[PDB]
Design an enzyme around this catalytic site. Sequence first.
Site, PDB file in Angstrom:
ATOM      1  N   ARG A   1       0.818  -1.197   0.000  1.00  0.00           N
ATOM      2  CA  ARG A   1       0.000   0.000   0.000  1.00  0.00           C
ATOM      3  C   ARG A   1       0.859   1.258   0.000  1.00  0.00           C
ATOM      4  O   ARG A   1       1.739   1.424   0.849  1.00  0.00           O
ATOM      5  CB  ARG A   1      -0.942   0.025   1.188  1.00  0.00           C
ATOM      6  CG  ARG A   1      -1.719   1.298   1.227  1.00  0.00           C
ATOM      7  CD  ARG A   1      -2.827   1.198   2.193  1.00  0.00           C
ATOM      8  NE  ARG A   1      -3.433   2.499   2.408  1.00  0.00           N
ATOM      9  CZ  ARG A   1      -4.682   2.663   2.817  1.00  0.00           C
ATOM     10  NH1 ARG A   1      -5.450   1.601   3.026  1.00  0.00           N
ATOM     11  NH2 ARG A   1      -5.157   3.884   3.000  1.00  0.00           N
TER      12      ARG A   1
ATOM     13  N   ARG B   1      -6.306   1.217  -4.018  1.00  0.00           N
ATOM     14  CA  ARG B   1      -5.277   0.688  -3.137  1.00  0.00           C
ATOM     15  C   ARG B   1      -5.226  -0.832  -3.163  1.00  0.00           C
ATOM     16  O   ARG B   1      -6.220  -1.511  -3.444  1.00  0.00           O
ATOM     17  CB  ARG B   1      -5.420   1.253  -1.706  1.00  0.00           C
ATOM     18  CG  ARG B   1      -6.476   0.622  -0.820  1.00  0.00           C
ATOM     19  CD  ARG B   1      -7.857   1.255  -0.921  1.00  0.00           C
ATOM     20  NE  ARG B   1      -7.891   2.713  -1.102  1.00  0.00           N
ATOM     21  CZ  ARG B   1      -8.029   3.624  -0.134  1.00  0.00           C
ATOM     22  NH1 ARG B   1      -8.119   3.266   1.143  1.00  0.00           N
ATOM     23  NH2 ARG B   1      -8.074   4.917  -0.452  1.00  0.00           N
TER      24      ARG B   1
ATOM     25  N   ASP C   1      -7.039  -2.264   2.029  1.00  0.00           N
ATOM     26  CA  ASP C   1      -7.588  -1.360   3.028  1.00  0.00           C
ATOM     27  C   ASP C   1      -8.208  -2.228   4.119  1.00  0.00           C
ATOM     28  O   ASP C   1      -9.089  -3.053   3.830  1.00  0.00           O
ATOM     29  CB  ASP C   1      -8.661  -0.460   2.397  1.00  0.00           C
ATOM     30  CG  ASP C   1      -9.103   0.674   3.308  1.00  0.00           C
ATOM     31  OD1 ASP C   1      -8.225   1.309   3.931  1.00  0.00           O
ATOM     32  OD2 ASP C   1     -10.328   0.956   3.361  1.00  0.00           O
TER      33      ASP C   1
ATOM     34  N   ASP D   1     -10.115  -1.559   7.494  1.00  0.00           N
ATOM     35  CA  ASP D   1     -10.762  -0.604   8.385  1.00  0.00           C
ATOM     36  C   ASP D   1     -11.337  -1.357   9.577  1.00  0.00           C
ATOM     37  O   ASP D   1     -12.049  -2.347   9.407  1.00  0.00           O
ATOM     38  CB  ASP D   1     -11.908   0.113   7.655  1.00  0.00           C
ATOM     39  CG  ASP D   1     -11.435   1.145   6.646  1.00  0.00           C
ATOM     40  OD1 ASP D   1     -10.240   1.513   6.651  1.00  0.00           O
ATOM     41  OD2 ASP D   1     -12.289   1.615   5.857  1.00  0.00           O
TER      42      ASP D   1
HETATM   43  N1  LIG Z   1     -11.587   2.584  12.482  1.00  0.00           N
HETATM   44  C1  LIG Z   1     -10.430   2.791  11.823  1.00  0.00           C
HETATM   45  N2  LIG Z   1      -9.848   1.844  11.070  1.00  0.00           N
HETATM   46  C2  LIG Z   1      -8.688   2.075  10.407  1.00  0.00           C
HETATM   47  N3  LIG Z   1      -8.022   3.240  10.427  1.00  0.00           N
HETATM   48  C3  LIG Z   1      -8.525   4.256  11.156  1.00  0.00           C
HETATM   49  C4  LIG Z   1      -9.774   4.095  11.904  1.00  0.00           C
HETATM   50  N4  LIG Z   1     -10.047   5.237  12.550  1.00  0.00           N
HETATM   51  C5  LIG Z   1      -9.062   6.097  12.222  1.00  0.00           C
HETATM   52  N5  LIG Z   1      -8.155   5.505  11.421  1.00  0.00           N
HETATM   53  C6  LIG Z   1      -7.008   6.249  10.872  1.00  0.00           C
HETATM   54  O1  LIG Z   1      -7.360   6.549   9.515  1.00  0.00           O
HETATM   55  C7  LIG Z   1      -6.130   6.966   8.925  1.00  0.00           C
HETATM   56  C8  LIG Z   1      -6.236   7.158   7.415  1.00  0.00           C
HETATM   57  O2  LIG Z   1      -6.638   5.935   6.817  1.00  0.00           O
HETATM   58  P1  LIG Z   1      -7.094   5.862   5.272  1.00  0.00           P
HETATM   59  O3  LIG Z   1      -7.084   4.416   4.939  1.00  0.00           O
HETATM   60  O4  LIG Z   1      -6.169   6.771   4.369  1.00  0.00           O
HETATM   61  C9  LIG Z   1      -8.785   6.490   5.190  1.00  0.00           C
HETATM   62  P2  LIG Z   1      -9.804   5.555   4.022  1.00  0.00           P
HETATM   63  O5  LIG Z   1     -10.016   4.165   4.462  1.00  0.00           O
HETATM   64  O6  LIG Z   1      -9.169   5.689   2.564  1.00  0.00           O
HETATM   65  O7  LIG Z   1     -11.220   6.315   3.988  1.00  0.00           O
HETATM   66  P3  LIG Z   1     -12.526   6.036   4.903  1.00  0.00           P
HETATM   67  O8  LIG Z   1     -12.038   6.162   6.323  1.00  0.00           O
HETATM   68  O9  LIG Z   1     -13.468   7.127   4.451  1.00  0.00           O
HETATM   69  O10 LIG Z   1     -13.001   4.647   4.557  1.00  0.00           O
HETATM   70  C10 LIG Z   1      -5.165   5.876   9.389  1.00  0.00           C
HETATM   71  O11 LIG Z   1      -3.791   6.278   9.315  1.00  0.00           O
HETATM   72  C11 LIG Z   1      -5.647   5.574  10.809  1.00  0.00           C
HETATM   73  O12 LIG Z   1      -4.805   6.197  11.782  1.00  0.00           O
HETATM   74 CA   LIG Z   2     -11.819   2.758   3.889  1.00  0.00          CA
HETATM   75 CA   LIG Z   3      -8.539   2.766   5.726  1.00  0.00          CA
END
Ligand SMILES: Nc1ncnc2c1ncn2[C@@H]1O[C@H](COP(=O)(O)CP(=O)(O)OP(=O)(O)O)[C@@H](O)[C@H]1O
Ligand SMILES: [Ca+2]
Ligand SMILES: [Ca+2]
Length: 159
Positions: A83, A93, A96, A98
């Site tokens: 990533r 990506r 991911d 989450d």
């Molecule tokens: N529940 C969670 N799960 C994963 N990361 C989280 C989170 N809450 C906050 N974060 C933070 O989110 C930051 C950015 O993550 P990204 O992956 O760039 C956002 P994304 O998943 O692209 O968008 P989205 O949050 O709208 O789905 C991470 O570096 C992490 O510290």
């Molecule tokens: Ca996401």
């Molecule tokens: Ca994410």
Amino acid sequence: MTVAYIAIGSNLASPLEQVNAALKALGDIPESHILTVSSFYRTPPLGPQDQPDYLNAAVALETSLAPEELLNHTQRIELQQGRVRKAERWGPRTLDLDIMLFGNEVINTERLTVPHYDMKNRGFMLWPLFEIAPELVFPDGEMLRQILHTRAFDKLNKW
Ligand SMILES: Nc1ncnc2c1ncn2[C@@H]1O[C@H](COP(=O)(O)CP(=O)(O)OP(=O)(O)O)[C@@H](O)[C@H]1O
Ligand SMILES: [Ca+2]
Ligand SMILES: [Ca+2]
Ligand SMILES: Cc1ccccc1C(=O)CSc1nc2nc(N)[nH]c(=O)c2[nH]1
Ligand SMILES: [Ca+2]
């Protein structure tokens, strides 16, 4: 122990391979065991649409890790699967991970916000979650089944 629920997405570099590798890596997280893996779904991209379709799934992971320690591992796995951070918001990506839910906990730290801030508005999160945890109740008492019964979401197609 607590059950954490993790959303998996991939739309680059062979998503099936990425997700299978991620499942192996998730199992290798310490103090943690996978309880359930959803079906894999092929979903149209939401947000910017000029990118490939996603493979989306959900996993139930039983863990005795602290919530931020779990995040440490999920971030490590993403980085180890190539990533790369691009400037575009919500761009494609390889992987991911989450954290949707961490038991009944509400977490608000600098690095981690749980429940995921937008999950109740995302069919690609809620449908795989319902497949593996149809009885789920959110920290605010809302029932997953009731959200999916009431709100208009497109049906998901399996991968
Ligand atoms: N529940 C969670 N799960 C994963 N990361 C989280 C989170 N809450 C906050 N974060 C933070 O989110 C930051 C950015 O993550 P990204 O992956 O760039 C956002 P994304 O998943 O692209 O968008 P989205 O949050 O709208 O789905 C991470 O570096 C992490 O510290
Ligand atoms: Ca996401
Ligand atoms: Ca994410
Ligand atoms: C739902 C939504 C509404 C408005 C703005 C942004 C978004 C995203 O989710 C953007 S990032 C993202 N978009 C996604 N689309 C799919 N199908 N699957 C995913 O895992 C995924 N992740
Ligand atoms: Ca383990």
